[PDB]
Amino acid sequence: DLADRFAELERRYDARLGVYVPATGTTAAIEYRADERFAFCSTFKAPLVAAVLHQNPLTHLDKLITYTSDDIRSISPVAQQHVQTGMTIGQLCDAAIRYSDGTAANLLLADLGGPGGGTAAFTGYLRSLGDTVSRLDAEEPELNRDPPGDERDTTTPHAIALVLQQLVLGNALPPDKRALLTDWMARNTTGAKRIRAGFPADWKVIDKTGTGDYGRANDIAVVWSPTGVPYVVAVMSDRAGGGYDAEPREALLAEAATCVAGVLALEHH
Numbered sequence: 001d002l003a004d005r006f007a008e009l010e011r012r013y014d015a016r017l018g019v020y021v022p023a024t025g026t027t028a029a030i031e032y033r034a035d036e037r038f039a040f041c042s043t044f045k046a047p048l049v050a051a052v053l054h055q056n057p058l059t060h061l062d063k064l065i066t067y068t069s070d071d072i073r074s075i076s077p078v079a080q081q082h083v084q085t086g087m088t089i090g091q092l093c094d095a096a097i098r099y100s101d102g103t104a105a106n107l108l109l110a111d112l113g114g115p116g117g118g119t120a121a122f123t124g125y126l127r128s129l130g131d132t133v134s135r136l137d138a139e140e141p142e143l144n145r146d147p148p149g150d151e152r153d154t155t156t157p158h159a160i161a162l163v164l165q166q167l168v169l170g171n172a173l174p175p176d177k178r179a180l181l182t183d184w185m186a187r188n189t190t191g192a193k194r195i196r197a198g199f200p201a202d203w204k205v206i207d208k209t210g211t212g213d214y215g216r217a218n219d220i221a222v223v224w225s226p227t228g229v230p231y232v233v234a235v236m237s238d239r240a241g242g243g244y245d246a247e248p249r250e251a252l253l254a255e256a257a258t259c260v261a262g263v264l265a266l267e268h269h
C-alpha cells in the first residue's frame with residue numbers, strides 16, 4: 001500500500017516525509033505523517049501574501065517600500081536588484097512567492113504587523129482561517145534554522161494544505177485578490193524539480209517551495225486535472241540525520257508527488 005511506498009522513500013533518502021492531499025467528492029485523503037510538525041521554511045510566504053492582500057485594497061500594492069543593504073540579511077535575489085530604488089508592496093509579493101526572496105518576506109511581515117509584530121500578525125491570519133496549529137516565531141533567515149523537534153516556525157502537512165485550499169479553492173479571498181495569488185504561484189521559478197516534476201504536463205500546477213537547514217525541502221501546490229478538477233498537495237521533508245548542513249533532496253519531493261499523481265490520475269472503470 002501507499003504508506004509502505006512512502007516509507008521506502010524515507011529509507012532510501014534517509015529522510016522524514018510528510019504528505020497531505022485533502023479528500024474530495026471522488027477521492028480519499030492521502031495522509032502520511034500529516035499531523036507531524038515540519039518547519040514552514042519559505043512556504044509561509046504564500047499565506048503571508050494572502051494576509052497582505054486580504055487586509056488592504058488593491059491600491060496598497062502600489063505603495064513604495066524603501067529599504068537598505070542593512071535590511072538584506074537573507075538571500076534576496078530581487079531585493080538586491082531593487083535596493084537603490086525600492087519595491088512596491090505588489091513587487092514584494094511577486095518576489096516573495098516567485099523567487100522566495102527573504103527580504104521581501106520580512107518587509108511584508110512589517111507591513112502586516114509592524115516591526116516586532118509581523119510574525120504574530122501572520123500567525124493570527126492563520127488563526128483567522130481556523131488553523132490553530134501553525135506558528136511563525138522568527139523572520140528570515142532565522143525561521144529556516146530551528147532544530148528538529150522545536151515547535152517554533154512549524155506547520156503540519158494537513159494544516160498548510162487546508163490553508164492553501166481556502167486561499168486558492170475557497171472564498172478566503174475575493175476573486176480579484178485570489179487571482180493575483182494564483183498568478184504568482186503559477187509563475188513560481190523555484191519549484192520545477194518538486195511537485196511539478198511529479199505530475200504529467202497536461203496537469204496544471206501552481207506552488208510555493210521552502211528549503212532550510214537540517215535537509216529541509218517542502219512544496220505546497222494546487223493542481224488541476226486536464227478537465228479542470230482541482231487538488232491540493234502538501235509535501236514536507238527533512239533529513240535531520242545529517243545535522244544542520246544535511247543536503248535537502250528535491251527528488252524525494254518529486255517522487256512523493258509522482259505517487260500522489262498516480263492515485264489522483266489513475267482511473268478504475
Ligand SMILES: *C(=O)/C=C/N[C@@H](C(=O)O)C(C)(C)S(=O)O
Nearest residue numbers: 041042074075100141210211212
Ligand atoms: C525559503 O524557504 C528560503 C530559504 N532560504 C534558505 C535556503 O536554503 O534557500 C537559506 C539558506 C538561504 S536561509 O535564507 O539562510
